[PDB]
Amino acid sequence: ESKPPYSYAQLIVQAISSAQDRQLTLSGIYAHITKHYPYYRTADKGWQNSIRHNLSLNRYFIKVPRSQEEPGKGSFWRIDPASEAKLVEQAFRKRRQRGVS
């Protein structure tokens, strides 16, 4: 339909996991995928608010600060550490649902 390979949860992983350390901002995860993904470039009237909503429902994603939002010289989203080797598993490969909840 549009983004069948990366999903608004694993797409973030390659976005944050493949990012400098492991954190991305709302407009960071976006500039990230369109950077390595040749699909996101002239169309974003959908996953835009999705990611923000996905970063919430996603189970292996969190914010860089303790818990309260606090923007400054550096403050964005981030993926869990012990969930990385797990999430990235879907970030290094395409969307698979053979056995991964």
Side-chain angles (χ1 to χ4, degrees), residues 10 13 83-94 98 100:
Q10 168 255 93
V13 183
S83 317
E84 271 232 33
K86 204 240 93 180
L87 39 114
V88 295
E89 180 152 77
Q90 225 172 218
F92 280 116
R93 230 206 228 208
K94 278 113 89 278
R98 57 185 218 265
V100 57

Side-chain angles (χ1 to χ4, degrees), residues 55-96:
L55 299 181
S56 261
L57 51 106
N58 297 144
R59 323 237 236 162
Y60 46 93
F61 282 152
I62 77 189
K63 307 266 282 223
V64 311
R66 280 162 255 178
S67 267
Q68 289 167 245
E69 316 114 33
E70 283 206 43
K73 302 118 155 276
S75 310
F76 355 104
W77 270 88
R78 42 144 56 234
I79 84 197
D80 254 31
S83 317
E84 271 232 33
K86 204 240 93 180
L87 39 114
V88 295
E89 180 152 77
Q90 225 172 218
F92 280 116
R93 230 206 228 208
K94 278 113 89 278
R95 232 177 110 154
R96 271 295 213 183

Side-chain angles (χ1 to χ4, degrees), residues 2 8 30 39-51:
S2 24
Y8 306 128
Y30 312 151
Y39 175 68
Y40 282 116
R41 174 219 177 113
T42 47
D44 55 47
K45 271 216 57 119
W47 69 296
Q48 209 55 200
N49 62 58
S50 310
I51 275 20

